[PDB]
Amino acid sequence: KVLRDNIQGITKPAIRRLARRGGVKRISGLIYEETRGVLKVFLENVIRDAVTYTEHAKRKTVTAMDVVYALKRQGRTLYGFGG
């Protein structure tokens, strides 16, 4: 199955909840698009590293360890998924 427009699967109340957790009281209407793009700027910076790990391990399945090492490279290390 083809995958298209899944960036709009990140709904406006999800970005609202992420803003409420971040302490934002009032959110503009132009936020919910742009932050989504920043999420792409996050995700294309992360998985492109992890696939580069998965291409080196000669694997077709992206594991949790490749995501952990991709977060290790980006200076955004994560506890709870190995490493």
């Binding site: 290390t77 506890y79 709870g80 998924f81 190995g82 490493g83």
Partner: protein
């Protein structure tokens, strides 16, 4: 397949500091990742200074100055005291 971890050691330390307190699996994974991250950071710092001082070994002094460089003041000082007392009572015994 044996998967090595620091589970029983963190369990011993936790029962030493809090006997009526258990840990969850996610928090245990976080603690085990923290131990490996701190180990890798201190070992990489000691390897860096060993490469700097033209020396093919890593002794207690390199780990000591790596702890003094990485950890903040009170934490580094207490870890320095703990490391030195452990090295001395390993040397005597």
């Amino acid at each position: 397949s044996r998967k090595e971890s620091y589970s029983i050691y963190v369990y011993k330390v936790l029962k030493q500091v809090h006997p009526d307190t258990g840990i969850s699996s996610k928090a245990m994974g976080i603690m085990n990742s923290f131990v490996n991250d701190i180990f890798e950071r201190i070992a990489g710092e000691a390897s860096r200074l060993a490469h700097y001082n033209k020396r093919s070994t890593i002794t207690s002094r390199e780990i000591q100055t790596a702890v003094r460089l990485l950890l903040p003041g009170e934490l580094a000082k207490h870890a320095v005291s703990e490391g030195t007392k452990a090295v001395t009572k390993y040397t005597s015994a």
